[PDB]
Amino acid sequence: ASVYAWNRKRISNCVADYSVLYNSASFSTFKCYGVSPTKLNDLCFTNVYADSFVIRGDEVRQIAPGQTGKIADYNYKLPDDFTGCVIAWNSNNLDSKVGGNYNYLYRLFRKSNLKPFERDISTEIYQAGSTPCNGVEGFNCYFPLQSYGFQPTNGVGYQPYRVVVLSFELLHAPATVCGPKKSTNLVKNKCVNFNFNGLTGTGVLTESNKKFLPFQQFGRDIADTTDAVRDPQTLEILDITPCSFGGV
Amino acid sequence: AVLTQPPSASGSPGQSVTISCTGTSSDVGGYNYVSWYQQHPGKAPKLMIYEVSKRPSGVPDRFSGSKSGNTASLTVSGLQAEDEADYYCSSYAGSNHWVFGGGTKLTVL
Amino acid sequence: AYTNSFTRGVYYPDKVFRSSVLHSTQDLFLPFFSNVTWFHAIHDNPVLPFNDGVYFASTEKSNIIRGWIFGTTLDSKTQSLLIVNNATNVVIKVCEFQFCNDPFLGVNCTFEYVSFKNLREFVFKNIDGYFKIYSKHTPINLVRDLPQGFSALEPLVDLPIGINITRFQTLLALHAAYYVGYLQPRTFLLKYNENGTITDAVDCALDPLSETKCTLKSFTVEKGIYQTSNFRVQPTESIVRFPNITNLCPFGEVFNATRF
Amino acid sequence: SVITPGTNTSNQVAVLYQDVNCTEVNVFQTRAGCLIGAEHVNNSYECDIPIGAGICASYQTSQSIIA
Amino acid sequence: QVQLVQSGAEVKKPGASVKVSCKASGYTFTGYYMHWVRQAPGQGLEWMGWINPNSGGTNYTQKFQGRVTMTRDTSISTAYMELSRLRSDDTAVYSCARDMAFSMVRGSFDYWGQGTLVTVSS
Ligand SMILES: *[C@@H]1O[C@H](CO[C@@H]2O[C@@H](C)[C@@H](O)[C@@H](O)[C@@H]2O)[C@@H](O[C@@H]2O[C@H](CO)[C@@H](O)[C@H](O)[C@H]2NC(C)=O)[C@H](O)[C@H]1NC(C)=O
Ligand SMILES: *[C@@H]1O[C@H](CO)[C@@H](O[C@@H]2O[C@H](CO)[C@@H](O)[C@H](O)[C@H]2NC(C)=O)[C@H](O)[C@H]1NC(C)=O
Ligand SMILES: *[C@@H]1O[C@H](CO)[C@@H](O)[C@H](O)[C@H]1NC(C)=O
Ligand SMILES: *[C@@H]1O[C@H](CO)[C@@H](O)[C@H](O)[C@H]1NC(C)=O
Ligand SMILES: *[C@@H]1O[C@H](CO)[C@@H](O)[C@H](O)[C@H]1NC(C)=O
Ligand SMILES: *[C@@H]1O[C@H](CO)[C@@H](O)[C@H](O)[C@H]1NC(C)=O
Ligand SMILES: *[C@@H]1O[C@H](CO)[C@@H](O)[C@H](O)[C@H]1NC(C)=O
Ligand SMILES: *[C@@H]1O[C@H](CO)[C@@H](O)[C@H](O)[C@H]1NC(C)=O
Ligand SMILES: *[C@@H]1O[C@H](CO)[C@@H](O)[C@H](O)[C@H]1NC(C)=O
């Protein structure tokens, strides 16, 4: 998709291996924020959003929290508390035409900056001056979208790049998107090292009478530690009691 | 609406000459988008001044533009033999239309 | 027409189970006892501002209200969220719909999903492109006005639409009064009972007594004098002063200098 | 500061703005600050809820907070 | 380096139509507005209109409306100007001039074509 109309795919209820993605050397850019890729194939998320678009080389650096430019201001803006990874690779062999590929566009004029994760695909005439444009292009009335050249003989900074931005959200909910590994059986009334949808800790798992609502997946204590979890396979509530301890 | 431009401006070598360009209140006097072009015979016109007084790169400082009311002015100080050419003014005229001047021949006496 | 919002407009700020605890959270809530516009459906479907989030409630007897429209122009020129519930199928679309001059129901799409006696309250807010929908259904027996009481709205749907929503309109089934409120960034102290149900709340900006309750993290205040906040006069306008020297700095002859 | 009887008696409160004048803010000016909501009574009594600078408040008579 | 190469000279009779081409090179063709100007032999410059190679929008001055048509083909970076219902005093050299502003029309031309002489003889 064009960067001004960047496509978004919502990934849910599936199993993915990010380790194979990181293993692949097709990617020229792979910087993660708030989470490292080596520690990505053992964390479950509730939803994964895949934003994809095409920009040129020297604009790849603008896909990051707190960056400025035509793309980050008018086309695709990332929040400052962004948690995810930015992936890009040179797509000159696919997105370039001998006469120039004019299908990839970008927003050049806009009255203000985009909010984080906002998309603006309007084709209204940009009123640059004081006189209204009434949807008529011309003097002080610009078309807001400009097209990339994208020719094979272009410099690397002007060659097309395909960007995929994965953003991870930890909604307090049943984490469906997980990495790998099989599940195991659950042992009650014993001290175990548990992992429920990516949430780990140590404690004794027992039966409970805590009536979680259908939308609630985790409970918390005063200290913000996990109090109880809902088993992702059988929708029962299990209390987590830290393993027996005391002074000696 | 044509831009009124004197038919002939002239001067001796080294002298200063001014080429006027009179429009109306809805082109010259309405917007600060007056331009000046220089056309030698049989060649394509060359932009010398745009936006009334801004000079493109490569244009000599001897060429200077200005505007007063509905009348713009192109001034050429230190007239030289190579400055002998036709000079056309231009201006936005509203409604997404631009207009030219009648043209002035600049002769080195 | 206006009515008393009393204590309506409290929803679960997140999806974490808590019980026997007073939890302080800051979110977009309907201020207590605020003014909400009272609309009628007798013998009237204007476009209202969305601002920073909208509180919605309706009373039904024949399911007249069946949907909502959110967007900026609602005229097929931009994307506008459309939610329609017809009998048993909830339909949500974000297409660039061409709406009628007066949209009603008789008796370039990027997303599609398909699924008085009853009070149906809703909250619609957009945070960083996420359209968050909360609701709670409860039986009532009252025609004149909103029933008095407290009931929390659980979250159900979160749509990452990324649409800039500034105005909205409702959809009526023509051959049911409804209320429109607005959210503010108030701090609330939420009381979770032993079953994890919110049974009360304190609006920390409703009044000095509520401020005291929030300060002490309790719904009971003992007799005495408490220091709860700090009074500060806010500025009204900015003052910008600079020397009136119109000279531009000659950076051109420094960077674009002929020789270095 | 919020001057209040316990919630088991009444939900009426008086507000004390500490060390300010009754300008920028049933208004009683004291040396402790600007006290708004408490009725000024000429009769003195034993201190109940202390305010400061010799001024105390209580809930009395129909009932209201007095200073 | 910008180059605007126009088609060859054309000889026409009154009532016919003519199509002038203008192939650009050395820059992103969609990035700059293209203007069309004609100049009768010995006479002055005359503005005809402009086209945006990006959006495709055009505007023509009043005296040429109904007879002029400006199009472009982005795949070959070529702009076209068509003038119908030709008359004797339409004999002129027609030139395409690139607007120097980037993705805006401002009426200042920095690159011109060599011109295309269109002769409408008796
Ligand atoms: C060519 O442009 C003219 C000029 O439009 C005006 O200037 C613009 C910059 C903007 O400010 C417009 O709102 C102005 O109207 C167009 O003429 C106008 O066309 C609109 C059509 O919606 C009409 O409402 C206006 O009355 C027209 N004004 C005049 C003076 O004629 C014209 O349509 C354009 N032509 C093409 C082919 O694009
Ligand atoms: C979301 O839409 C609103 C209006 O639908 C935008 O507000 C407008 O902003 C422009 C300048 O950016 C003003 O000239 C208009 O007067 C505003 N209109 C209203 C009704 O306030 C708002 O800017 C949009 N959001 C973003 C991020 O662009
Ligand atoms: C998954 O677990 C559930 C238990 O809730 C079971 O009913 C279901 O058959 C299991 N499916 C598979 C494929 O093992
Ligand atoms: C509510 O409306 C009434 C009258 O319409 C007005 O007196 C009152 O101040 C309003 N309150 C708020 C909080 O808007
Ligand atoms: C409801 O509307 C959808 C489209 O919005 C339509 O496909 C469907 O048939 C309608 N009726 C029911 C019962 O879903
Ligand atoms: C709708 O999508 C098409 C491409 O499929 C695009 O050309 C058109 O401009 C879009 N509509 C709007 C209003 O942008
Ligand atoms: C919790 O639910 C049980 C029934 O499962 C009920 O007996 C009990 O009173 C409820 N407690 C609260 C505080 O609602
Ligand atoms: C408050 O200001 C007034 C003048 O407006 C002054 O007379 C009075 O003494 C001030 N109060 C105190 C406590 O100083
Ligand atoms: C209170 O006492 C003052 C003098 O100290 C007097 O002026 C005022 O009128 C008295 N008010 C009442 C209600 O007794």
Author numbering:
A (entry chain B): 348 to 595
B (entry chain G): 2 to 110
C (entry chain C): 27 to 69, 80 to 143, 165 to 172, 186 to 245, 263 to 347
D (entry chain C): 596 to 620, 641 to 676, 689 to 694
E (entry chain F): 1 to 122
Text of the article:
S from both SARS-CoV-2 and SARS-CoV-1 uses angiotensin-converting enzyme 2 (ACE2) as the cell surface receptor (Hoffmann et al., 2020, Li, 2015), ACE2 is expressed in a number of tissues, including epithelial cells of the upper and lower respiratory tracts. S consists of two subunits, S1 that mediates receptor binding and S2 responsible for viral and host cell membrane fusion (Walls et al., 2020; Wrapp et al., 2020). The S1 fragment, at the membrane distal tip of S, includes an N-terminal domain (NTD) and receptor binding domain (RBD). Although both regions are immunogenic, the RBD contains the interacting surface for ACE2 binding (Lan et al., 2020).
Antibody 88 binds to the back of the neck whereas 316 binds to the top of the neck, orientated radically differently, however, the H3s of the two Fabs overlap well. 253H55L also binds to the all-down configuration (1 Fab/trimer), as does Fab 316 (3 Fabs/trimer) and Fab 384 (1 Fab/trimer). Loss in binding and neutralization with Fabs compared to IgG is quite modest for mAb 88, which attaches in the all-up conformation, but much more marked for mAbs that bind the all-down form of the spike (253, 316, and 384). Bivalent attachment to the down conformation may also lock all three RBDs, preventing attachment to ACE2.
